[PDB]
Amino acid sequence: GLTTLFWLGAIGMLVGTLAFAWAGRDAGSGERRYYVTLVGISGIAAVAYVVMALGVGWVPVAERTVFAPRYIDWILTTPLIVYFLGLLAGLDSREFGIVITLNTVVMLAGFAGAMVPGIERYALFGMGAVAFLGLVYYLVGPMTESASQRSSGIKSLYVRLRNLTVILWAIYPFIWLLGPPGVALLTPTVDVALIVYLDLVTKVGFGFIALDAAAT
Amino acid sequence: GLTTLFWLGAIGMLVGTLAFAWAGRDAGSGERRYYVTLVGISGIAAVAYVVMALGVGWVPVAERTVFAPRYIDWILTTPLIVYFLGLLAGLDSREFGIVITLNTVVMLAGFAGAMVPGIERYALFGMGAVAFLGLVYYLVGPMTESASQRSSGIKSLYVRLRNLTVILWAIYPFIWLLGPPGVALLTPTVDVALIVYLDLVTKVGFGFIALDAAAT
Amino acid sequence: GAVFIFVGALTVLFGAIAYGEVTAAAATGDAAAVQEAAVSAILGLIILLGINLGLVAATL
Amino acid sequence: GAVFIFVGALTVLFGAIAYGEVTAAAATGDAAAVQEAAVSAILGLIILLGINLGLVAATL
Ligand SMILES: *C/C=C(C)/C=C/C=C(C)/C=C/C1=C(C)CCCC1(C)C
Ligand SMILES: *C/C=C(C)/C=C/C=C(C)/C=C/C1=C(C)CCCC1(C)C
């Protein structure tokens, strides 16, 4: 059942949210921004999953069904994930506006493409993909260089979080292609299940690994 | 095609065999026994896969087909794998005859059970499983204690090889239960494919990890 | 080590969801409907390996 | 790192074998035959995760 999967998403995101608010209660002098950000990432996502679980935002497009809340989520949370990674890396402002802009282009292209019945949706996907490679270049390149200047515990947490992000974000566009927006080889249910799993790892899992290391 | 999968098994085992004979050419004063053993493990298996690929040893049993060579392989090679692990661990002779006997009981029980149409094949499986837990206890217990006394490079290679063995050998009895000998939920082709993959990792993969560490 | 048991638990959950689609398709009596459900399940499970590896890799 | 690409390569090979069974079943026109082929493919792929994890774990 689709709404059952959405409800499991909501509950997972909530647990994560409550966990980050709680853990954050005793955050250091310049660590609050991390905890605030994670409550933002998982809290926004929880609300989105609730909305989908209630049946709202299910858009008909040709022969598929596009979940608008999913994409509105991504546009808001994925740059917050990138902001988090920018914090460990130690970016200045200029470096932020590049990657965040790249990231935003990806989600808008996926969203746009998702909403287009015609074959030109693949061109839109094309542009999202090119922007993604741009984002990846920044994560593994310059931002990694930046992160090398920091204390080794922070570097190691960066590499760990960058690896989780780059690997798992690279899976999304495949779900897009094989799923309803692309060739429709994955049923809506399987598409939703995979994303729910991804969203929980990329946000809640991402977060807990950070809780683990902020202690250790 | 079944025989195609067997032929891929044979070729994989052969490559491994040639690799171990070659690498062994420049083995140390007390390292030859390791290389000899790996040529034994992968060479016996190669011959078995060739035999199956040629269509020989396909035994009719009730509504399934049991590959006798597969099991004759296991009876010969699995104790050789255990002998290898006994070498890194530094066992004396008494400790060898326990684990090898345990191991032998597992394969005979699987083989016997495989050849029995009746429901009592699960009792035979039962006994194989109990012996396996016995073997596992020795790998993670006493043999691990033994291996701790050795130089750290050997200890680390032991843990690495013990982990690969315990984890992957634990998968076999599930293939037995879900496959043709058990509930027949896995088609013969899928059963053969999974085992081919396992046999290559547990032997050739096992071996290469040892080549990697005997250098490093 | 506990990560695997989490991964394994979810992987069988996902299998059960996919399987549940296959069987519903089967009760339809239409082989094409079962095949469409089967391809989705195979591709999903392949994709699911990649997620688990990423989660394992990142944690290992 | 190369291990993953080896694992991924094999995992898609296995998918293609399983899929090839599903389709052969499909050409039969019998939904039950497709379902029997689908369950085998799902269980195989689940089992295949465990093998890949073991190989990853042992190597990580
Ligand atoms: C918590 C939710 C997350 C981390 C969502 C990440 C989504 C992506 C990385 C989507 C990437 C896409 C492309 C790279 C291509 C165009 C299709 C997209 C938007 C799905
Ligand atoms: C290279 C070939 C190898 C490492 C084969 C290993 C086979 C096993 C560990 C089989 C175990 C079984 C049980 C534990 C239960 C009874 C069924 C068996 C024999 C399949």
Numbering used by the authors:
A (entry chain A), B (entry chain A): 3 to 218
C (entry chain B), D (entry chain B): 23 to 82
What text does the study give?
The photoreceptor sensory rhodopsin II from N. pharaonis (NpSRII) in complex with its cognate transducer NpHtrII serves as a model system for studying transmembrane signal transfer. This complex displays a 2:2 stoichiometry where two transducers are flanked by two receptors. The long rod-shaped cytoplasmic domain consists of two HAMP domains (present in Histidine kinases, Adenyl cyclases, Methyl-accepting proteins and Phosphatases23), which are followed by a methylation domain4 involved in the adaptation processes and a signaling domain which harbors the CheW/CheA binding site5. HAMP subunits contain two amphiphilic helices (AS1 and AS2) joined by a non-helical connector.
In an intensive crystallization screening we obtained two new crystal forms displaying space groups with the I212121 and P64 symmetry. Resolution for the both ground and M states was 1.9 Å in the case of the I212121 space group and 2.5 Å in the case of the P64 space group. Since no substantial discrepancies were found between ground state protein structures in both space groups, we will discuss the structure in the I212121 space group as it has higher resolution. Although the crystallization conditions were the same as for the wild type “U”-shaped complex in the P64 space group, in this case the space group is P21212 giving the “V”-shape structure similar to those observed before. Summarizing, the “U”- and “V”-shaped conformations of the NpSRII/NpHtrII complex may be crucial for the mechanism of signal propagation spanning the membrane domain and feeding into the HAMP domain. This work also represents one more evidence that different crystallization conditions and/or different crystal packing may force the protein to adopt different conformations corresponding to discrete functional states.
